[PDB]
């Protein structure tokens, strides 16, 4: 498989993602690249281990996560190796799905369904010890047929080196409060992003928006209310907003999980 471009689907957080065609499968694919340091021991171990762990997911054939189907270290210098990641292509994200969705909802059973695949997908990820960390409506892809597929999970550590040279473009409206370290950087971080996606499906704009960490972290307390120590206008069903808060529980250790969430009255 030598892959050949066919579009430039986006140039977000992890560089330029090209759409390419598999020349014997005929299927489309979403390519991304990453620069890695070529050490004295060859390939950086964390890259090998993390990339390998993503490659293995595909075995589970889970319907709510994009398969990483191929990897190639293409270039190579005494300081760097360039690795392209070959993902299953999904032509639209959650945005485009929410933008071409006429006034006003709509509807709930469809939002419930989305949320239900989203938590299934995430539960899968989390179980296999993979945290997304950068969950976005862009990361949330939607097939024609309504299957939500999670993408760009488990690339945080793979992209660490490249991103430290040097952006930093931090679209921050969904980041868990923790991510603004201290400290972790654990699994719950994705459930905060879930709830922020949760709300915005009934809303139509990212609650907690732009500005810096402090402005971002401030706009969170506005709706959740400041967390006394030591903690350091719904449009959906009443039951819906119940789950949402549980997700938006500023504290990780008693914030709802993707499995506990799945087992909620609202579902």
């Amino acid at each position: 498989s030598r892959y050949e471009p066919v579009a430039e689907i986006g140039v977000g957080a992890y560089g330029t993602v090209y759409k390419a065609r598999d020349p014997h499968s005929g299927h489309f694919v979403a390519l991304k690249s990453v620069r890695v340091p070529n050490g004295e021991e060859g390939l950086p171990i964390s890259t090998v281990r993390e990339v390998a762990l993503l490659r293995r997911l595909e075995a589970f054939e889970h319907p709510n996560v994009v398969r990483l189907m191929d990897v190639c270290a293409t270039s190579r210098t005494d300081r760097e190796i360039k690795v392209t990641l070959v993902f299953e292509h999904v032509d639209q994200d959650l945005r485009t799905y929410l933008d071409k969705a006429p006034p006003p909802g709509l509807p709930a059973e469809t939002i419930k369904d989305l949320m239900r695949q989203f938590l299934r997908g995430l539960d899968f990820l989390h179980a296999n010890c993979i945290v997304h960390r950068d969950l976005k409506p862009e990361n949330i892809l939607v097939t024609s047929g309504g299957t939500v597929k999670l993408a760009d999970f488990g690339l945080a550590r793979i992209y660490s080196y490249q991103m430290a040279l040097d952006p930093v473009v931090v679209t921050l409206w969904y980041r868990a409060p923790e991510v603004l370290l201290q400290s972790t950087y654990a699994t719950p971080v994705d459930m905060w992003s879930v709830g922020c996606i949760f709300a915005e499906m009934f809303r139509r704009k990212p609650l907690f928006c732009g500005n810096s960490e402090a402005d971002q972290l401030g706009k969170i307390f506005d709706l959740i209310g400041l967390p006394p120590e030591d903690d350091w206008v719904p449009e959906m069903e009443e039951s819906g907003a119940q789950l949402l808060l549980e997700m938006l529980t500023f504290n990780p250790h008693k914030r709802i999980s993707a499995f506990r969430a799945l087992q909620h009255s609202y579902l």
Partner: protein, 249 residues
């Protein structure tokens, strides 16, 4: 693979799926290799095992590195002069995957008497990973052994003895062509079977899981119970030729 609950066998089913994606070809010496022969594979494999033993590697390193070796050999013809280079690169990648402190490119070359060199190893590593498509997180017989063991009403003192014998059988298989024909699950099962049986034979009221273990693991594995049987007997045969590797000198 750590669920958040206890409502969430589902694990084992996953292990079985993964292993299918990392199977070598049974006919690669015929259809792919022109120089490399099974007795050379044996040679490189026994080299690789002595290195892991000498270095006290994590048990999984040797079987994982052979999976790599058989897999590559399924995809690329290799010159017999490059085989040792391949085996060392397989160990290098397998160590990175499974060890807290992996083997260094240099230390591996030392074991080749410096017949190969680090830059050679570093260049092979990229070839190997790329060819396996970075699907390096393969199952080993050790994965299944420990899984089976967790299902068995054996006292931990029993389990540890079983574990020791079964890991011996695995290393034996990995040097043999059988490792090519049989998935890690099969290999782990034959070795567990051969282990629990031999043990029980010398301790009749102990290691009671020996009874119909083949069918049992067959059901757990979802393999053919006569395939497991053949496998085990191939393992017992292979051990009975371990007194020729003991007196090959």
């Amino acid at each position: 693979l750590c669920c958040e609950v206890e409502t969430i066998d589902r694990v084992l089913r996953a292990m079985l799926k993964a292993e299918e994606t990392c199977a070598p070809s049974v006919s690669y010496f015929k259809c792919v290799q022109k120089e490399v022969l099974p007795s050379m594979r044996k040679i490189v494999a026994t080299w690789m095992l002595e290195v892991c033993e000498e270095q006290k590697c994590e048990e999984e390193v040797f079987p994982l590195a052979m999976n790599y070796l058989d897999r590559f050999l399924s995809l690329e013809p290799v010159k017999k002069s490059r085989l040792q280079l391949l085996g060392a690169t397989c160990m290098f990648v397998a160590s990175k995957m499974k060890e807290t402190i992996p083997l260094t490119a240099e230390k591996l070359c030392i074991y080749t008497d410096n017949s190969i060199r680090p830059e050679e190893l570093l260049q092979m590593e990229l070839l190997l990973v790329n060819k396996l498509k970075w699907n390096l997180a393969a199952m080993t017989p050790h994965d299944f052994i420990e899984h089976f063991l967790s299902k068995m009403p054996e006292a931990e003192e029993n389990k540890q003895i079983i574990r020791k014998h079964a890991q011996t059988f695995v290393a034996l298989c990995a040097t043999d062509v059988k490792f090519i024909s049989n998935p890690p699950s099969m290999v782990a099962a034959g070795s567990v079977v051969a282990a629990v049986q031999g043990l029980n034979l010398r301790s009749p009221n102990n290691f009671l899981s020996y009874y119909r273990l083949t069918r049992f693991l067959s059901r757990v594995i979802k393999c053919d119970p006569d395939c497991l049987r053949a496998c085990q007997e191939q393992i017992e045969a292979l051990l009975e030729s371990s007194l020729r590797q003991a007196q090959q000198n």
